[PDB]
Each structure stands twice: as structure tokens, then as C-alpha cells.
Amino acid sequence: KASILTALMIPKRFRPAKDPLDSPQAAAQFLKDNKYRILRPRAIPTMVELETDAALPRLRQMVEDGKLKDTVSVPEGTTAFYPKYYPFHKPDHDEVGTFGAPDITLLKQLTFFLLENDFPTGPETLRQVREAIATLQYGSGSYSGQLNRLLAMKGVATGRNPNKTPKTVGYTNEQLAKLLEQTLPINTPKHEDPDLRWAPSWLINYTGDLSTDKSYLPHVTIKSSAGLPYIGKTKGDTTAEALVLADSFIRDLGRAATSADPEAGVKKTITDFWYLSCGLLFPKGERYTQVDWDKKTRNIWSAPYPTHLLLSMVSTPVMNESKLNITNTQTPSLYGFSPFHGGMDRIMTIIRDSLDNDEDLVMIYADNIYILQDNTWYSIDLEKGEANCTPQHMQAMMYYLLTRGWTNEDGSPRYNPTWATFAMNVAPSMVVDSSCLLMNLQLKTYGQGSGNAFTFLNNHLMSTIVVAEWVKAGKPNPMTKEFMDLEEKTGINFKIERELKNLRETIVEAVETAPQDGYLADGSDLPPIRPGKAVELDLLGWSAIYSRQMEMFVPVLENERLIASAAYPKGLENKALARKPGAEIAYQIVRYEAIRLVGGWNNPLLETAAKHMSLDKRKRLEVKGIDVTGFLDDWNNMSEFGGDLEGITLSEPLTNQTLVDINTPLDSFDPKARPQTPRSPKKTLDEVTTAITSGTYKDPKSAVWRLLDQRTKLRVSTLRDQALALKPASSSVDNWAEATEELAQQQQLLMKANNLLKSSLTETREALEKT
Ligand SMILES: [Cl-]
Ligand SMILES: [K+]
């Protein structure tokens, strides 16, 4: 019985608080009070329409064939205005909808299944999912979170442990390159890949003939932001404009560098294209802690499309040929590592051999360091990695790429003076210690912009410096003050994230507790009643579980990440796909299959609930006669785990065979059969460090490499003379090696003059910030 009034008419959803910093006035005051640098704002000319065939002559046929728009929009207007970037933050105080909704259906299903099943780990799984729903929130944070994040970046860069250039730490570019030959082994780009000698649009071959139509340019995310000067546009809306701007910037830089006044010309080009150094401060979508919603929002420094393209032309041809890591090469690098297809078992074999031989082990992946020492596994992360970066760290990376990557077999460069100018003299100051845009505020970026094309490379170099210093200090244990003292030594902040004790015993336990029943145990299509002990390496987010069926370790997503993903799944995040009938149900199937595939299969309660949900959806589709195989075959793009599990289809329900197939290695593994690094093959990181400590590798032997190192010390007014010193090697003239030797000697001699010594990175930053 209820009243007529009533008759007439699970954790609660998180509602973010009102954000007091959501206005330019309040945000600017907050930053001023916290002494965060706000730049004097710079203006961008309005857009002018130009004919595509005049601006991009190489693409005339594409315009004629109606495959490319006949006009391009470029910032050449008579009036210039200050740009404004207002990102959405969801959920927010006024809007708590489907975006960032926790999976309450899964929570109810986990509860129903726990009541029917006696899984000993079942109560803890339910408790963890409920706790993650109650304490976390998937979304794009807040203006307060973004602003507080900027303060933390400034604190890392300039606070307790101010940043140090590699030169202050005690490394020359050549010494760093010797370390990188070991920690980031690289191959040269393919001989058929064009050298760094051209305007980007010249790398497009279009005639209409499908058999030959090719682009030698890097691939791009079409739906991603164009960045400045095209706020609100995607890369798909602005590819022609990006080519025009990237061609103009490289062309103007090249002409200015060899002009009668290189300093005036180079500075003018940099000032005219200032916006190529300013990133849109995009709030990153993550599973944030509800109580810290306004205290921290991670940012993506959204690089201008032309800058992204020019930087990617230097890095991607090298990196595409350099998927060299500890599982296939004798290197600490984890670059290109996959724990699938036997990857985790190769890691476990290396770990087990190190433990058996009483050897220390180090692994590096960007801002992640892994140390095995004293029967303990340590996970060390750089503290807000990007904030530690100086333009000189990126310049050392450019030096490494141009000396070890962009080089011919005879030692001649695979670049001309224009590209050496962009790469060495300008590019590091475009994305490191430059600026970002939030609302109408042009803010200083402390360190490198997170998400720029060189993020991974720059972070990897910083971890390389920390590791080289660790080796130099006699490998102090990560839990000691001697290890923590490497922060001040390097100017790089870091923290011990994980300490996995009794490693040897943990591995024995993981093998012994491996279940006899279920997936990868006896190979049935059921989870184990009692999962075995995981080796919680958190190796790029992965733990290791022993398989009795396959007689190997296999990866499972680290528990906390698995629970967070189950509690707050990412939605479809594609309005076009979402409007197609069956895309939502297909995405729901994908979400439940992917959570099982990454590790849910080994969590009995989670596997039971997720299997039931995906089977129920498939059954409904079958009865209804609705075919979604198209979406299920091309599932990768609709899943946060899509990049992790390539080459598999979700059109058939997950079985033991799916788990066998994803873990199947192409080849057997022998760690002793791994090739040595392409450069200094016989040398180890320890031998290189010993050589450096003694004063070796200060200068490269190659005159071409000496010119490139001198390029990092000489002021911009010397660019025309530096171009003349490089022209013989760059043109591969007869006797270029002897000619380069004489020119590098003449240049080293003239460098005695201190008035010629100024970082072009400082000159670039000064020209970018000019008002
Ligand atoms: Cl940031
Ligand atoms: K620092």
C-alpha cells in the first residue's frame, strides 16, 4: 500500500562539482598566483582561399580527377586574431549522461553469477568492481584538473629537481648516441624511402593509376585534431592545408638559412609560423579518481598538423625499420614489444636465465624502467616524464636519428642542409619548452608536449640517462638513497612504482599453482575454479600466468587495469558508426570479448558474467536475423584493446582455441640466438658507460657527424656557412669525404670565436615568443 501521490508519480553516479576555474579570468589569476608563465598572446591571420593547383602543383591531376578539393584555406588574411580553444569536459556538473557511465549491467551480472557459483576469488572480484565504480570515473576531467596538471609539470621541470640538459649532466651528443645504440638500436630507413631533401607534398605520387599511386609520407589519424591554425577541424578536413603549411615552412626555412642575412630570415620564418609550436591543451579521457577529479586531468599537447607531419618524416621511416627489443635483439629496449604470440614467455625466459646466472637486468620503454636486481623486480617510472625534457634532450635524439638512421652505407648523409636546419636547429624548440592553448590563454609548456611525434623517443632518451647513471653509480638498489640521488645527478624526476620481492620464489609459485582445469590448463572452454598465482611484473601493463597446456607463461592485463576497464568501459566514441543499426550491440559484444581476451578469461566470475553477456547478445542477433559480422571482423577500432590483439576476429565466440592462437609463437626462442645491436654489436650498455666515464666518444670520428654536432652550438647567422660545409657530402660529389674533412676542420677552427656560439634552440624560442 502506497499513497495516491506516489501512485501518480549500486553506487550513485558521480556528478563533478562546479568548476570555479572554467573562465579565462579565473584560470589566468590561478596561474599567476601559482607563478606559472602565461605568454604575451600571439595572433593568427584570418583564412584566405587559394587554388589547390597553384598551392600544390604536384597534385594538379588529383584536382582534375575531382579527388582533391580545388581550393585550400591558408592563414594569409589582412587581419590577425588571437586563437581560442574551449574543450568539453564530460561528465560535468550540468551533464551526467551515457558518456562515462559505469557498467552497472556487468555489476548486476557479476552479483547474479557469484550467487550461483562457488568461485573462491569471486567475492574479491565483485568487491573490486563495485569499489572501482564507486571511486573512479571515466571521462575528460575538468579545467581545474588540466590547470593543476600544468602546475605539477612546472613543479617537475623547475621545482624540487630542476631539469638539466644532457651537457649539464656531462654527456655530449656522441656519448648519448653511443648509449642509444644499445638502449634504442635503430636501422636506417629503407633504401627506397626518400631522403630528407624534399617538401612533404613531393612525397605524393598520384596519376590515377591504382597500381602505382603512393604516398611516401607518414600515416595519420584522420579523425584526430588538426591543431593550430585549424581549431575544430580534423586531419581529414585539413590534409591539403597541412601540406601547404609544411611545404612553406620547410621552403622558407631553407631559403632563409642560405640568404644574405640567415638570422633575420630564419627568425622571421619562425615568428610568421609561431602557431606551429603551440599545442591545443586537450583533456585526456581516463579513469580518474572521483575525489581527485579537479586536482588532475592529463593533457594531450595537440600538435599542429604541419609540425606533426615534418617531425614524423624524420622519426617514422627510421622507427618502422627498428622494431628491435629484448625479445629479438640483445638490447634493454622494449620498443615494439607485444606480450602476445610468445612475447611474455620470451621475457620470462630472459628473467629466469638472469636469476639463474645471478645477473642484473634492465629494460626500457619510454618513461618506464624495469630493473631486476637482488631477486626483486622493480618498476621505475619517470615522474610526469615529459616535464623533465629540455629542448637539448630532443636535439640529442635528432642527432642520433640523423647520424645512425639518415646515413648511407658510405657515411654520406640522407639529408640536405635545409632538413639538417629543421631537425637540429628549429624542431626541438617547436615541441619542447614551447607553448599551449587553453581557452584564450597561450601558456608556457614546461618540458615536452605530451603526445608530440617525439614523446616516446624523448622519454626513452631520458630513461637511458637515468639507467646509464645507475650503471655508473655501481647499480645501487632502487630502494636506497644512492638510487634516489640519481634524480639530482640527471635533473630527471622518477619514482619506484612497484617492488616485487622474492622473484625466484614467485615464479616457482606461478608454475606450481597453475590450475589443472580450464582455459590453457586442460584446454576446456571454462575459467579455472582457482586461478594460479600471477607474476605481477606490470610489464607495460601486463602480468604473467603459467599455462600447463602450452607449457609457457602467457600475459594477463594487470588486475587493477582489468577491473578499471570492466567498471568503466570506453564507449563507441564514433558518432558515424554509432548511428548504424547494430553498431551498439556489436560494440557491446566487442567490449565483453576484449575484456575476456586481455585477461578476464582467467578471472572466473568476470569470465562467467562477460561470456553470458556476449553469448546473450549473439543469440538475440541470430534469432532476429541481424548480421554484424562486418563490425565484429573489423573490431579493433572500436576497442581500447584493439591495438593489443591485431589479426583476430570476434565473429565467432571466444574459446580456448582463441587463447591458444593469440599466444602461439611463430618461432621457438633461444636468448643466445638473438642478434646483437646493429651498431657496436659486441658492446653492452655497461661497456659504453665505462668508456664514457673514462672520457671516450666526446666527438664523433665522421666529419659529417662532427658538422651535425657543431650545428647544435653555432648561432643561426652561421647557417649559410654551415650549408656550404655540408653541401659536398649532401650532394655526394666526387671526393666528398676529403672535402667534408677539410670543411669540418675549417668550421671547428672558426668556432674558437665565442660570438658565434649560441644555441639556435634559444633563438627559435625567442622568435616563436616574439610579439
Ligand atoms: Cl600536461
Ligand atoms: K626535473
Residue numbers in the entry: 11 to 19, 31 to 792
The authors write:
A second construct lacking the C-terminal 55 residues (ΔC55) was therefore cloned, expressed, purified and crystallised. These crystals diffracted well and the structure was solved by molecular replacement using the structure of IBDV VP1 as a search model. The IPNV polymerase closely resembles IBDV VP1, with an r.m.s. deviation in Cα positions of 1.2 Å over 678 residues. The structure of IPNV VP1 confirms the previously-identified rearrangement of the catalytic palm domain, with the non-canonical ADN catalytic motif (residues 387–389) lying at the apex of a β-hairpin in the active site. Strong electron density was observed near the outer edge of the palm domain, between the side chains of N184, N409 and N514 and the backbone carbonyl oxygen atoms of V177, N182 and G512. This feature, some 15 Å from the putative active site, was modeled as a K+ ion based on the strength of the electron density, the ligand-to-K+ distances of 2.6–2.8 Å and the hard nature of the six ligands. Additional electron density resembling a protein helix was observed in the active site cleft of both apo and Mg-bound ΔC55 VP1. Based on the presence of strong density suggesting a sulfur-containing methionine side chain, this helix was tentatively assigned as residues 11–19 from the otherwise-disordered N-terminal tail of the protein. As the 48 Å separating the final residue of the helix (M19) and the first residue of the polymerase domain (I31) is too great to be spanned by the intervening 10 residues, the N-terminal helix presumably derives from an adjacent polymerase domain in the crystal.
